[PDB]
Ligand binder design. Sequence first.
Ligand SMILES: [K+]
Lengths: 549, 548, 548
Amino acid sequence: DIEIAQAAKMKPVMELARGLGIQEDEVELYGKYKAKISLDVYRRLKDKPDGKLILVTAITPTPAGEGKTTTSVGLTDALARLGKRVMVCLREPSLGPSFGIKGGAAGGGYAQVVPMEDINLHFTGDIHAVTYAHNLLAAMVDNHLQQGNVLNIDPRTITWRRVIDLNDRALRNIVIGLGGKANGVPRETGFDISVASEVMACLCLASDLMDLKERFSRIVVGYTYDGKPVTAGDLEAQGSMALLMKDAIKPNLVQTLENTPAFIHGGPFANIAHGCNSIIATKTALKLADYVVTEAGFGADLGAEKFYDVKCRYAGFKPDATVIVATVRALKMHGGVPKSDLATENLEALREGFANLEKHIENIGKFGVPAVVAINAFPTDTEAELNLLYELCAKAGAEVALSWAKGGEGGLELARKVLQTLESRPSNFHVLYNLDLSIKDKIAKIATEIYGADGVNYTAEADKAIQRYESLGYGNLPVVMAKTQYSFSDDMTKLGRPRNFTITVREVRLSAGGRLIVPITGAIMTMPGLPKRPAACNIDIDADGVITG
Amino acid sequence: IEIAQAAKMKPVMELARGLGIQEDEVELYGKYKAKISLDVYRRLKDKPDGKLILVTAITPTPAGEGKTTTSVGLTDALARLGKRVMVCLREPSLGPSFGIKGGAAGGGYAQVVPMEDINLHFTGDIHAVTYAHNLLAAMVDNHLQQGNVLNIDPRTITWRRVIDLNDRALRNIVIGLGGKANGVPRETGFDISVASEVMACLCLASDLMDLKERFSRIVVGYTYDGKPVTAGDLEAQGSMALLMKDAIKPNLVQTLENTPAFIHGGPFANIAHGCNSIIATKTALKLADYVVTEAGFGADLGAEKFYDVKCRYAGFKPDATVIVATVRALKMHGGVPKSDLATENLEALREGFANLEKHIENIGKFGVPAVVAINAFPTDTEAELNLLYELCAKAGAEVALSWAKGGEGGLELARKVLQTLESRPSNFHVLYNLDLSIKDKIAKIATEIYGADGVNYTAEADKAIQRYESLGYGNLPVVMAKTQYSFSDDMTKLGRPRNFTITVREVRLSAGGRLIVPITGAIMTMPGLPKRPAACNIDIDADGVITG
Amino acid sequence: IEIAQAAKMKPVMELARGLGIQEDEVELYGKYKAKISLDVYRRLKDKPDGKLILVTAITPTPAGEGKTTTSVGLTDALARLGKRVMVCLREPSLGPSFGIKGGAAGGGYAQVVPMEDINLHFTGDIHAVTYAHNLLAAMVDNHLQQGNVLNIDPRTITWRRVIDLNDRALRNIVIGLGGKANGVPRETGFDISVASEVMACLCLASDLMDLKERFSRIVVGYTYDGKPVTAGDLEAQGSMALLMKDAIKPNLVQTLENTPAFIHGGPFANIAHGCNSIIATKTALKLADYVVTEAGFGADLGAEKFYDVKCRYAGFKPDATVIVATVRALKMHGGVPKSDLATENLEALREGFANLEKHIENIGKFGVPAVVAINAFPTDTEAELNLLYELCAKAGAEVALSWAKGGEGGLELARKVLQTLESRPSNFHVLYNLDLSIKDKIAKIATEIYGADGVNYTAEADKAIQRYESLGYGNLPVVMAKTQYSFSDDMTKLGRPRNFTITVREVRLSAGGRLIVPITGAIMTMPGLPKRPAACNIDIDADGVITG
Ligand SMILES: [K+]
């Protein structure tokens, strides 16, 4: 009944593949339980329609828990139990978190995909290809200078950093090229955490190997002494990179605890990226199944938004429904209660925190998709609470998910009401904004309509960029708001449903292998720090079995 | 084209069976690559080993060596006569594939396959070492952030970071910049990933429990008192050990002639012994009658080291040894330039012979047989060859045209190898001892093997040794870090230099292994991409590779 | 040419006599420059002071200010009528002389001489501050080298180094690189030398024993606990005090009209009060009936500061005050561009007047008289002037054409200054108090003086204050570090902006003085040479200067 102590019996993925429609020649085994499926599978099944796409998201997250994936998986396993042909598409966790603050499984209890240990570590080697595909560009950028600098790059203008998959602050700000005319040119850079690499973003949005290789060449490394952009294409590097991503362009097949098939592929930041998994693992899921569940980072103001305005936008996807997660406790926090006394009944705070849930319901409504709530179960929650939380959902179908405890069975209810709105309430999907708007215009819609904010404030730095950009052609791309996820505002302290406030964007970045980033506060945290007490200081594989994963 | 050599492989799952391996003791990576578990060895603990055939070579040159190919052709030749044999080789760094290009996994009809997977991600063995090396560092730098609880002096940290690409840029850098919330500023840099110690330990550990132990011996730096700290002191070993949980397993593959190839690990042959893994071969030893391995650089290092290093720890006993040498290679040793190798010559063939001839002598000195080998070549007319033939008046000496005659070419030699590994018995003893003074150890290595009449140590050198021995790391082996293109450090003294001397400028202690004594500027622990990188020329069709 | 103004000076040794100074209380530096000892003041401790005539000005613009000249013309005018008076000015940084060029020591027939010596080495007053600032740092960095005996966290050191040149290069750098024998790596940088605190303290110390004391209060940084360390904590003050032993003496000189000029010290008017030395003037006060000084920037800072700063500590009481303003200057305040100042205009002359008019109001607020002053100009036709004339309906208001009429020009004003410093008496009180909350102090400064309706503080700002007050440095004055080209921080809101607000991003505590609250990016504590440096154009004939 403890998570890691729950890695028992799984069927060979080949068997799972055959049973989905995969041929032997479209599978590349990684042990009896991991497979890389050729992009041919999909390529040959493009004329068949898609199943029903179900996006699961949640309310503004707090340090008081919530649990998105647990539900993502349980819902699946439940749909599977009800006789449905389904799959689950998920992101691959970063290596770093496993040693810093320990690595939890994909969801948990009896709601998780396996093999665990392998998915938190090296899995199928996707993050390394991404780690080197990327780091090779850095290297190639540097070499060019070293070799006379023909393209004419002001090193001091190099925006494309380096990257690694652990947590090293010490790598945040650094100086390179020291030594002499024989060691390159001196400059200031640093490392981010792989998953934050723009290379990981393209992976999760690219069509196939050739669309990938193209984006890779549209990537801006730095600028000339004239301001003119020098791109990765200019360095003739898209060729090599792609080749480093040759095997990483294939989804990875692996199942749940209960043997439902699942796709783990990709996984970026949901503030500096759409925070969704690869589009390819999903579009493949849509053809091999009748129901596809996938989740999206942070709250519904972020992952949700970006899922629709980026992912679905690029792939012509059209969601059929959206399950939204909420807990009794994390709702009473938004209601005002402290983290300390969260276990104590208080229908008031409960009812005031609802405002958080209420807004998301509505927002999810501005996208034209029928929402369904999933009150994640909990020991201390009472009836005088859950009950109020149901009648409080005067809008969308509500239902409790004992998915954690009772495997697919606790998600049975949730499954039945999804199929329910899935049958009577067909979706009318439309992105929140048109691409032919101004950048400050799209930024408002998102913060005016989704964050429920009054308006937006920009800093001089913010302006200058939002224009070197526009006038430079990248003005009609999607906008990826990078703010704090702990609120509908850029102040991580304004819990619940903050009214009468303004967003303040202070810097704006570009991801030519996608679109326009735009951080608010220090949402730049692109490289976490190992806590004073290293979860690694206690990690120790035995002569056979690990301990402290 | 030698990459067009891609053709006809046999499921590894089968071969493992065709060697006797419980399926449950094999993890795949596609149908033609597969990791074998440590339970194989451990379950065949006492069974009979086999014959060792370490194939070293002359003293490298720009004419064309043959360290690898000739090692495989001797497998497609050896086994090609109903013989239970394998090949224990080394995995090539990724970086070089975009710098100067990727070469044959061995050479001609010997190169292990698939070629690509070996020269790239492979079974992701590197990345494990990588992430294990950098996590240690990560913990080092993080620690200081906490309060340098161990009173460590950032300026003494000798533990670098590591990347498997060719980047001059990362060689000398400053990190930890930013302010009380970014960490402590100190200087460091990056070394190529294969030049890692966390790589050596890999090639020289008993098992995934031996590894978890070494690591904890590895020195990150010292305190403000000169008191050595270690990864152990940081409780990393555990974590570290896990990042390696799978890389610790050898890798199975075949040849174009489907012979059971074992490619696991691979370090530097100056700072490191240049031997493939000790677990892959020791496993190989059971799984077959014979085992065709190979060490780093000219027999004056890889060889001299392979012995004192690998064999020592693993109690091995090289029932034989080889040593290649082309015709053109020795002429340069005769003063013959690279542009002056086309023309036949014999007055140089004999002087430049002194080269091949010297190693022969040292080979014997370890108490093991020996045999000559000649990479047959189009310009190697009869005249030239004929002379070489005889000169080898001291032990076996055949011609192996494996490069273009598959196993057939290596036929002649294969017989002679069994021929001498049958009549000529060997009693293995390490040319030196673990108790001699750290200097007397390098000593005996400069004398007999290299050919010097003495070894000097600078101000810097004297202190380190003394520091080490005063600390205890004095009863360790010794890994010569000298150049190689010459028995001596003078990368110019070609052939067989005489009367010289060796001077050991510095000395770096490798806790998880031994003592690295550098003679020249062999600190090029990070190669550099050129003005024409294969990266600017590499692309991948909507189907497959080009210019790989 | 205004440098050709070099002509006819009177031995300083004499002037000192023609003011009553014991020869033994005068050190020379040539016949026309001379340091006066602190014994002068100290020996005339109780004698009668005199009248203070702090000449401030409008709010700076690219049209032409007049902070200086007008200050001297009022001396060549004032004393030009048998009056015991001097001029207490500021010494210009060296650096600027090779960057954008060296300008008149005041302007026209007012500029103190010799011009060159003032804009160069002078009496080497800077270099003393310089070597005193950098020695502290030197000791800071050295200390850590010893064992950071004080458990100091290098990342908290706020004590920069300093050079008197315009170098962008030295702004942000890393030092202490090299290894356990070169020192500890940390980040820092260089600020211009005059922007030193070791300069402020100079202009605001009682005597060479007051100085030796302040210094020891100056914060270098904190320990790993947040525990403030100081130069005192390093036992530097002594040494430091000595490097200054001679700079602590004011400097005597004259005018083209030989009037007793006193040029000693000179800091920044944002991070610092921009006042000349407190010892030079307090000395001047005795040595004469009147004293014509001058403060930094527009009267909203130098002035507002001069008061709260200088006068406060030294118990002074500005028996009067002035404030220049050209005709063209106010029109820009009327929206009139720099290329649109040639044409007469009066509808702007009145709106842009709001500027001059506001300061007038604040001036009064400190409890001291006031008078207007207009730098007469060739394009300042009658029409324009006439309007200005009247508008000043609130107190004295004359025209001073000193620039080209020597003391004669400043005649009109000179009379009116005595005229009002005779009928209009002043009771001096600092616009604020030393006990009010550090915020309420900036508050009252933004309100009345600048003209804001409130002051904001960021996350960063709130902590610092709170940190400081929790440490005790809360009962100090407050030096506004806002831009100046506008009553507010908006370097664009010209004339007299209304309804706005001020936001104080950061707060740097200056132990040897006060609190520096920055509003904008006024951290340009190091100017930068341009693409056409006067250095590339400066040469010196086999005899004398050209392009100086
Ligand atoms: K992956």
